[PDB]
Amino acid sequence: LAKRIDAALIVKDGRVVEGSNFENLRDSGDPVELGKFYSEIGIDELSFWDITASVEKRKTMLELVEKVAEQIDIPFTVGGGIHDFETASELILRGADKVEINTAAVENPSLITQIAQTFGSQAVVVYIAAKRVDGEFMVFTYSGTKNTGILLRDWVVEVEKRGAGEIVLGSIDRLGTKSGYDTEMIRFVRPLTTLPIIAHRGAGKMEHFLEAFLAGADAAKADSVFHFREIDVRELKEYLKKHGVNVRLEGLGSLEHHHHHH
């Protein structure tokens, strides 16, 4: 019944892709300052999703993880093309609370178990990109481009069996949309796993988060809707609490310039 609000930042070469509209920041495209800003206004957890193309990706992600852990105190996940145990191991040891895998786990589900055996299930996030194909939810890999022919219902069960800690459920059918989370897909997955389910893609307004939690999501992740300020994070948490959703609010408070405190 406790619910989580997460912000995700897509990063390339240590930069926020397409930036943000927070001109109060010294550099609105710097993922550490943006991430620290989110942790101060009330985001519960962060995801840093790297799309660095060329041969610099591994070093780039280790450098990001290093800088994030030194400045940021809320949990964060790194993801985006993490392909084996040694890469994931390096990133956790460098300071990431959680590592997210997708394509590599679909192709080699043993990878889930290998990470969880050393670092515990709570360190493992599996991102599942799913799409309706001929009346069935399917799993897509390679940045949503490869139909694996694997059914979502089968993969969710296998992901829990292999030892993942939580699932991010990203609806390709909502990619870039603003009409709501894929609540039908969330409801479809909810009876199939006891793991935390994190909704991703489709958020356009505050009411969409309420819908996702009524559908059984344990957490809701968004990116552009926060970065370009269509939704204010504190306003969202106040709205959710007002309508009965158990979000984390008492741990915040100081954002209205209330007198002074030395």
Residue numbers in the entry: 2 to 263
What did the authors write?
Computational design of KE07 involved construction of a theozyme to catalyze the chemical reaction, which was then grafted into the scaffold of imidazole glycerol phosphate synthase (HisF) from Thermotoga maritima. Catalytically essential residues from the initial design include a base (Glu101) that facilitates C−H bond cleavage, an H-bond donor (Lys222) to stabilize the phenoxide intermediate, and a π-stacking residue (Trp50), which was designed to stabilize the transition state and favor substrate binding through interactions with the aromatic ring of the substrate. This initial KE07 design (Round 1; R1) catalyzes the cleavage of 5-nitrobenzisoxazole, with 103-fold rate acceleration over the noncatalyzed reaction and a turnover rate (kcat) of 0.018 s−1.
In contrast to the improvement in turnover rate across the first four rounds of mutagenesis, which was unambiguously the result of reduced activation energy due to changes to the local electrostatics of the active site via mutations within and near the active site, the catalytic efficiency of R5 and R6 is improved by more favorable collision frequency (the activation energy actually increases). Thus, the mechanism by which the remote mutations that appear in R5 and R6 increase activity is qualitatively different. This is mirrored in their location within the protein; in contrast to the initial mutations that affect the active site directly, the mutations in R5 (Val12Met) and R6 (Lys146Thr) are remote from the active site. We also solved a higher resolution structure (1.61 Å) of R6, in which the active site of both monomers in the asymmetric unit were observed to be fully in configuration B, with the imidazole ring (an analog of the benzisoxale substrate) of the histidine tag of a neighboring KE07 molecule in the crystal lattice bound to the active site. The anomalous KIEs observed in R5−R6 correlate with the increased sampling of the alternative active site configurations.
